[PDB]
Design a binder for this molecule. Structure first.
Ligand code: SF4
Ligand code: SF4
Ligand code: F3S
Ligand SMILES: [Mg+2]
Lengths: 534, 267
């Protein structure tokens, strides 16, 4: 049962946005891959000629999954263009909201987007909840009882006997599937935590709203700082702190143990979906003008050579269009970017995506949690090293295991755990600064008639940059280069496969009608196509 | 995906940022688990459904063709330029998909300013010819209930669905087809800073001591006076809303707000 032929997955579900994945498989293994993004909106076109202050409100609507991140990037971008150095507290509050975004985002990704590639929720019905409870209690400091889990089973049983499977309709695991390995008990624990995670994420998102007005789409950033004087009050800080502490507990006692259990059951997944090159921008600055002041530092690595991390040079970024539905074939640095749509249909003139293909020194680069974690590890980041080593030790694998779909999924968890802790450190530094009598959150500034600016965010899916050219005090050019653009964009004019496309080569496919293995790798990158294409 | 017992919901994603879908996950009393397992049958939703590809398309078909009927909830605008090619799912254009499915629903809810009025991708110069659902599909007789905002308050979606399920009819709707029970008042008339507005006490800048003290944000661009929404009343995430976080309303539940309300920091 080794299939030869094409497989198309369209829609790719349990991602943000509209993705089509096409593969060629030979003898049950993927030998070629295309990443096709099938919605364009053209926000870059829409921004032309507007007030630079308006940009963040438009660009935030690039994506409501990685909500806030684009508001932040645009505000950093215009702050930079304008030459304003925002107050300490603006930096703290913006960082805290971003840390909260990461926790919310990664938790939802693992449970509500990725897990159904690895968990057979209906097999949870066959489980023994007492045994399942024993297992859950052995992987976590949190004690779970048979009755706890029976309640979940009971609930699911009623749901399935109604014959209305809802979001589980036609799931690849229904009836069983050879690539689904978990035992009933583990499926039940995962299913319980999925459910739990639906309520816990409400609190993680609320934490952003405490300071940032609302989630989705925060409304507290301005050029020069933030607007939320209430964020200075002990009550709001206390409210934030309690949501953060509950969120971190969930990360530490539910998410990471579950991730470890599943990784251990799918250790063959260390063999698939690796990539060669990594880029990251760093995040959580002390100094808005110095990337190297960030808790995570920027860096670039080629061909897995982490003993030679290269400095990040922003001028070495070019976005290709040769295999994209834009005019021409000329790659452009974002300060000279162009967004000129020209549709040719699928593979017309060898074009197959609405995403541009960003390249760094001409190379395709993975960005996101695995890049952030590996590079930070290689820079001697002590928190990242500690958590990473522990994870590796629990799974009983060596560092080479990180270069794969499993590795990337693990890295997402590692980054969550580290950030969850660092949020507490920032919180305390914030409190400390207020206690010193610094109550300023916004700085004055003046609009230049002409200027260039760039803003950098390491978002949950990786290195985000917004680029502006101000002319006559207005937006002359505005270009977004987004993490999923790097990772999930198409080939470049050197015909180099993108990270997702290259990572798919070698994927085994047990059942071509239910190609979960392709989803596993694609989902491990946490694609966001609204982000990628904007 | 469904049959008798729970009413079926088909959730479509057009030209969207998924912020509207995320707002629904923030559902509070009832929570989204109660909603998915007890209130409704969510029979298609690309963001969270298990099936993908052909299996996903078959689930949609199954749901839309069900003799029990379905409610459609639509997120995003519909790109109509160039014969709809700027937005495709399963290599069909969004226009075509919506054209085929929405006339079959028992009721249609357009959720978010993109689906109600066109939204961010419809802002000038609107390169993809994005339209709201009712504009796009006027000719097929579709009249979606519009629940506006960017994204809307999820309280408003759940409230509308519950009404409909109880009364087998839409609630009273305003002239933009929005439920009056949620969109009947301006943001401004509900705003805690209205006494300052009345006193002519405006913050001149965000850094100012006037801003610190919570003076009115009108001079800083606040669109509250021209925007219909329940934000000050319900708030978001059970805890805050833009003006209480010190930032002007940008008018996000109003049609064409991207062009009508800009520049956001001017009045
Ligand atoms: S209405 Fe706003 S939040 Fe909702 S899909 Fe549109 S841009 Fe996103
Ligand atoms: S802050 Fe805005 S909504 Fe509030 S009183 Fe002033 S103009 Fe009205
Ligand atoms: S920006 Fe939108 S969320 Fe409410 S406060 Fe204004 S209508
Ligand atoms: Mg771009």
């Amino acid at each position: 049962s080794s299939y030869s032929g094409p497989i198309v997955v369209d829609p790719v579900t349990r991602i943000e946005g509209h993705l089509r994945i096409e593969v060629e498989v030979e003898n049950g293994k993927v030998k070629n891959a295309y990443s096709s993004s099938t919605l364009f909106r053209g926000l870059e076109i829409i921004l032309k000629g507007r007030d630079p202050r308006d940009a963040q409100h438009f660009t935030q609507r690039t994506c409501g999954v990685c909500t806030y991140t684009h508001a932040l990037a645009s505000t950093r971008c215009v702050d930079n263009a304008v030459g304003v150095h925002i107050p300490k507290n603006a930096t703290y509050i913006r960082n805290l909201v971003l840390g909260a975004q990461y926790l919310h985002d990664h938790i939802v990704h693992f449970y509500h987007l990725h897990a159904l590639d690895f968990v057979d929720v209906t097999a949870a019905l066959k489980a023994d909840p007492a045994k399942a409870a024993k297992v859950a209690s052995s992987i976590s400091p949190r004690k779970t009882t048979a009755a706890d889990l029976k309640a979940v089973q009971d609930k699911l049983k009623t749901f399935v006997e109604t014959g209305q499977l809802g979001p589980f309709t036609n799931a690849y695991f229904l009836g069983g599937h050879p690539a689904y390995y978990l035992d009933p008990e583990t499926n039940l624990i995962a299913t319980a935590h999925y459910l739990e995670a639906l309520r816990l994420q409400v609190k993680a998102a609320r934490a952003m709203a405490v300071f940032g007005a609302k989630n989705p789409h925060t409304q507290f950033t301005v050029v020069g700082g933030v607007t939320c004087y209430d964020a200075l009050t002990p009550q709001r800080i206390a409210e934030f702190e309690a949501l953060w502490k509950e969120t971190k507990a969930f990360v530490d006692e539910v998410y990471i143990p579950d991730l470890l259990v599943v990784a251990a059951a799918y250790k063959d997944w260390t063999q698939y979906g690796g990539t060669d090159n990594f880029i990251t921008f760093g995040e959580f600055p002390k100094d808005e003008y110095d990337l190297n002041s960030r808790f995570f530092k920027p860096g670039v690595v080629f061909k897995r050579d982490f003993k030679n991390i290269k400095p990040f040079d922003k001028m070495q970024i070019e976005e290709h269009v040769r295999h994209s539905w834009y005019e021409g074939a000329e790659a452009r640095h974002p300060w000279k970017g162009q967004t000129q749509p020209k549709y040719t249909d699928l593979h017309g003139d060898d074009r197959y995506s609405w995403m541009k293909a960003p390249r760094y020194m001409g190379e395709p680069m993975e960005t996101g949690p695995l890049a952030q974690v590996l590079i930070a590890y290689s820079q001697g980041h002590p928190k990242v090293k500690a958590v990473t080593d522990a994870v590796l030790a629990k799974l009983g694998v060596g560092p080479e295991a990180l270069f794969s779909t499993l590795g990337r999924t693990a890295a997402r968890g590692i980054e969550t755990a580290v950030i969850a802790e660092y949020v507490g450190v920032m919180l305390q530094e914030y409190k400390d600064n207020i206690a010193k009598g610094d109550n300023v959150i916004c700085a004055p500034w003046e609009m230049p008639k002409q200027a260039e600016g760039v803003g950098f965010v390491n978002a949950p899916r990786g290195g985000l940059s917004h680029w502006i050219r101000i002319e006559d005090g207005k937006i002359g050019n505005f270009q977004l280069v987004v993490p999923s653009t790097w990772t999930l964009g198409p080939r470049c004019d050197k015909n180099k496969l993108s990270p997702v496309e290259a990572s798919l080569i070698g994927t085994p496919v047990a059942d071509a009608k239910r190609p979960v293995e392709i989803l596993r790798t694609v989902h491990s990158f946490d694609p966001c196509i609204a982000c990628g294409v904007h | 995906l469904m049959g008798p017992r729970r009413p079926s919901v088909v959730y479509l994603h057009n030209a969207e940022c998924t912020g509207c879908s995320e707002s629904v996950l923030r559902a509070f009393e009832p929570y989204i688990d109660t909603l998915i397992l007890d209130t409704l049958s969510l029979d298609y939703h690309e963001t969270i459904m298990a099936a993908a590809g052909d299996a996903a398309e078959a689930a949609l078909e199954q749901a839309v063709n069900s003799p029990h009927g379905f409610i459609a909830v639509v997120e995003g605008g519909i790109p109509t330029a160039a014969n709809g090619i700027y937005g495709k799912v399963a290599n069909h254009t969004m226009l075509d998909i919506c054209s085929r499915i929405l006339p079959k629903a028992q009721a249609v809810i357009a959720y978010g300013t993109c689906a109600t009025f066109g939204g961010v991708q419809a802002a000038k110069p609107n390169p993809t010819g994005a339209k709201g659902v009712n504009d796009a599909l006027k000719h097929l007789g579709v009249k979606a209930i519009n629940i506006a905002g960017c994204p809307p308050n999820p309280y408003n979606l759940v409230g509308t669905i519950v009404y409909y399920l109880k009364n087998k009819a839409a609630p009273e709707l305003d002239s933009l087809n929005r439920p009056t029970m949620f969109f009947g008042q301006t943001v401004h008339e509900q705003c805690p800073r209205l006494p300052h507005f009345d006193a002519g006490e405006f913050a001149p800048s965000f850094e100012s001591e006037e801003a610190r003290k919570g003076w009115c944000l009108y001079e800083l661009g606040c669109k509250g006076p021209v925007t219909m929404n329940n934000c000050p009343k319900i708030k978001f995430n059970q805890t805050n809303w833009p003006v209480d976080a010190g930032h002007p309303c940008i008018g996000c539940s109003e049609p064409d707000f991207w062009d009508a309300m800009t520049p956001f920091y001017q009045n």
